[PDB]
Design an enzyme around this catalytic site. Structure first.
Site, PDB file in Angstrom:
ATOM      1  N   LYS A   1       0.784  -1.240   0.000  1.00 24.68           N
ATOM      2  CA  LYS A   1       0.000   0.000   0.000  1.00 24.68           C
ATOM      3  C   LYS A   1       0.816   1.291   0.000  1.00 24.68           C
ATOM      4  O   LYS A   1       0.451   2.262  -0.675  1.00 24.68           O
ATOM      5  CB  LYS A   1      -1.032  -0.002   1.132  1.00 24.68           C
ATOM      6  CG  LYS A   1      -2.199  -0.936   0.891  1.00 24.68           C
ATOM      7  CD  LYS A   1      -3.343  -0.614   1.836  1.00 24.68           C
ATOM      8  CE  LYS A   1      -4.252  -1.814   2.033  1.00 24.68           C
ATOM      9  NZ  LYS A   1      -5.257  -1.550   3.109  1.00 24.68           N
TER      10      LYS A   1
ATOM     11  N   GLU B   1      -6.630  12.873  -4.633  1.00 23.93           N
ATOM     12  CA  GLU B   1      -6.492  13.658  -3.394  1.00 23.93           C
ATOM     13  C   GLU B   1      -6.678  12.779  -2.149  1.00 23.93           C
ATOM     14  O   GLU B   1      -5.824  12.785  -1.274  1.00 23.93           O
ATOM     15  CB  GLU B   1      -7.438  14.867  -3.375  1.00 23.93           C
ATOM     16  CG  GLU B   1      -7.432  15.623  -2.050  1.00 23.93           C
ATOM     17  CD  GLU B   1      -8.435  16.756  -1.983  1.00 23.93           C
ATOM     18  OE1 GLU B   1      -9.418  16.776  -2.762  1.00 23.93           O
ATOM     19  OE2 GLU B   1      -8.245  17.630  -1.116  1.00 23.93           O
TER      20      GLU B   1
ATOM     21  N   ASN C   1      -4.474   1.480  -2.610  1.00 22.62           N
ATOM     22  CA  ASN C   1      -4.915   0.080  -2.743  1.00 22.62           C
ATOM     23  C   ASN C   1      -5.741  -0.201  -4.023  1.00 22.62           C
ATOM     24  O   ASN C   1      -6.371  -1.257  -4.152  1.00 22.62           O
ATOM     25  CB  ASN C   1      -5.707  -0.350  -1.492  1.00 22.62           C
ATOM     26  CG  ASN C   1      -7.110   0.221  -1.453  1.00 22.62           C
ATOM     27  OD1 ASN C   1      -7.392   1.259  -2.041  1.00 22.62           O
ATOM     28  ND2 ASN C   1      -7.999  -0.462  -0.752  1.00 22.62           N
TER      29      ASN C   1
ATOM     30  N   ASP D   1     -10.383   2.249   0.745  1.00 24.05           N
ATOM     31  CA  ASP D   1     -10.600   1.744   2.104  1.00 24.05           C
ATOM     32  C   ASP D   1     -11.627   2.553   2.885  1.00 24.05           C
ATOM     33  O   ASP D   1     -12.272   2.015   3.777  1.00 24.05           O
ATOM     34  CB  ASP D   1      -9.296   1.695   2.901  1.00 24.05           C
ATOM     35  CG  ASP D   1      -8.514   0.388   2.717  1.00 24.05           C
ATOM     36  OD1 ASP D   1      -9.109  -0.711   2.546  1.00 24.05           O
ATOM     37  OD2 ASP D   1      -7.270   0.472   2.778  1.00 24.05           O
TER      38      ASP D   1
ATOM     39  N   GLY E   1      -5.970   3.443  12.947  1.00 20.69           N
ATOM     40  CA  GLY E   1      -5.147   2.710  11.987  1.00 20.69           C
ATOM     41  C   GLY E   1      -5.475   3.136  10.582  1.00 20.69           C
ATOM     42  O   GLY E   1      -6.121   4.168  10.380  1.00 20.69           O
TER      43      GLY E   1
END
Ligand SMILES: NC(=O)C1=CN([C@@H]2O[C@H](COP(=O)(O)OP(=O)(O)OC[C@H]3O[C@@H](n4cnc5c(N)ncnc54)[C@H](OP(=O)(O)O)[C@@H]3O)[C@@H](O)[C@H]2O)C=CC1
Ligand SMILES: NC(=O)C1=CN([C@@H]2O[C@H](COP(=O)(O)OP(=O)(O)OC[C@H]3O[C@@H](n4cnc5c(N)ncnc54)[C@H](OP(=O)(O)O)[C@@H]3O)[C@@H](O)[C@H]2O)C=CC1
Lengths: 278, 280
Positions: A68, A80, A89, A104, A129
């Site tokens: 990633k 952006e 990803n 994500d 995270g």
């Protein structure tokens, strides 16, 4: 014509990644002659795999652990949201050029958009995270008014909130997580973006659930089991809930839209995941 | 259980008409093998990165067609014996990162031949002196053929293959001009059409005196579609045992997958798949 449109994934390990099955169920239902190629790619191999995809005339690919951040070096351009998050990803191949996207937080957002608009909303995110950072960025870009990042490691929460304040229209705030905490009464959206409940139906995030009512949309990133303890408790409290299975499917839909310009059916893809998990 | 399939494929341009994907994957599916065949359109500018791409994506092998058969050699680690003599590769195995070049262009033929007769110690005539004739001559020589005659309109093209057989193999090589109607030299065991005559044409036939063949002459044709060329329909009418180019393509696909996986796919499944495709 025996040429199929080519898509795929670079990650390691890749054997547990169900994206191939759901995306290809999408392709089939939509009657698209396209394939999703799940590749086990080591860190040493990424650069050559990327060049491979371009030479084999793929139109895009996903990138999971551990690629990633590494993939950014290979990009010609970057969206952006992707750049703010600091991870990619979902890469599009457009006219031989590589464009980095992050989905994500986009999977969450599209699931969210089935029940409410993010614009003007007060948001609490549990976690700091990769997932939390992605969700916070997409929320802020889509018009969210105030985002609170709640994390045991307050400094990780501090990093995301500063990002939100510095780079978006939204107000970001960090909160150190110690014990159960009460939600602000004005909380519109509560998101679990921690790993709590992953393959574990009994583990719930430490939040004071009585401070939670039907006025709050409760969301959880956990793909399996989709009906986490968190979502099950929120449901019994009358809340509308959104699950990580729906979110994962929507990452597949957003990805294919970026690669092919075509919207696959989420219902079909969710049933494929249901089949696999069940 | 699980989601990592064995990856194989093809590099070529153009790739849209190549039905290898459908044939091979019908074999994979029928065998219960979680393996895929990825038909890629790869320009010459992309060949190097495609080859290194298959390695990094941990593919176990790939085919190369036009226009990559010669160009691919520079990207290889090792080569098999026939591929070395032919000077072209169409089947590459990736073994723990090592790229090994094979040529199956004449091996499909040889597999088909062996169902009816041994090549070893036999006298053979090949019509044509292109890439297919060159590959078939080399495989025959390596499988023990005594004598190989190459018949071509351009006799100097025939000479090239004859000299390759004479100098670089244990077989004897002969070149002949194609003077109008060809008469099969007495004692020939096997006659092979390796010209493009009859490709998509069930009526066009190689100019040969068909009366020169014996009932015992094995008559073979490279043309995959239509499988029953005029040449093979005429030879069969005489009573000759015949071998079609569709069966040869199936065998190439079988051999290729044996190279890659050490598994033998069902030739019947693959043949039916090809017959269904070509009948259109
Ligand atoms: N459905 C979907 O589309 C997607 C789902 N996911 C899922 O999201 C989850 C999180 O992903 P990711 O961001 O990569 O994970 P990370 O490892 O990057 O971070 C996990 C977060 O969970 C927190 N956490 C873990 N255990 C506890 C606990 N007992 N109490 C409080 N906090 C805890 C960590 O806190 P601390 O900082 O204090 O360590 C950290 O902030 C994963 O389970 C993944 O499967 C991810 C992407 C998409
Ligand atoms: N079934 C299988 O597994 C395989 C089948 N093939 C097939 O074999 C065929 C030949 O392939 P390839 O060798 O690459 O083709 P090339 O273009 O390399 O060679 C063509 C050959 O055919 C001869 N020829 C063509 N038309 C005539 C004619 N009217 N009269 C006399 N001779 C003629 C040419 O003679 P000249 O030299 O005088 O021009 C030349 O020797 C193709 O149709 C291909 O589809 C190929 C590989 C495998």
């Amino acid at each position: 014509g025996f040429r199929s449109i080519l898509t795929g994934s670079f990650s390691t390990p890749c054997a547990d990644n169900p994206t191939v099955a759901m995306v290809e169920a999408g392709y089939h239902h939509a009657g698209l002659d396209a394939r999703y190629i799940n590749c086990d790619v080591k860190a040493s191999g990424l650069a050559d795999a990327v060049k491979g995809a371009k030479a084999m005339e793929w139109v895009g690919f996903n990138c999971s652990l551990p690629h990633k951040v590494a993939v950014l070096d290979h990009l010609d351009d970057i969206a952006e949201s992707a750049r703010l998050i600091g991870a990619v990803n979902c890469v599009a191949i457009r006219e031989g050029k590589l464009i980095g996207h992050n989905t994500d937080g986009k999977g969450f957002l599209a699931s969210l958009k089935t029940v409410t608009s993010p614009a003007g909303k007060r948001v609490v995110i549990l976690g700091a995270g990769g997932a939390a950072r992605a969700i916070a960025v997409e929320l802020a870009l889509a018009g969210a008014a105030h985002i609170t990042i709640v994390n045991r490691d307050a400094s990780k929460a501090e990093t995301i909130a500063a990002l939100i304040n510095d780079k978006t229209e939204a107000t970001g705030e960090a909160q150190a997580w110690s014990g159960k905490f009460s939600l602000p009464t004005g909380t519109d959206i509560l998101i679990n973006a921690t790993s709590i409940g992953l393959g574990d139906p009994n583990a719930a995030p430490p939040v004071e659930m009585g401070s939670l009512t039907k006025e709050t949309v409760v969301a959880d990133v956990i793909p399996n089991p989709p009906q986490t303890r968190f979502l099950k408790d929120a449901k019994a409290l009358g809340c509308t809930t959104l699950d990580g299975l729906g979110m994962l499917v929507n990452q597949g839909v957003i990805g294919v839209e970026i690669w092919l310009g075509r919207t696959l059916d989420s219902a079909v893809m969710a049933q494929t995941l249901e089949n696999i998990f069940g």
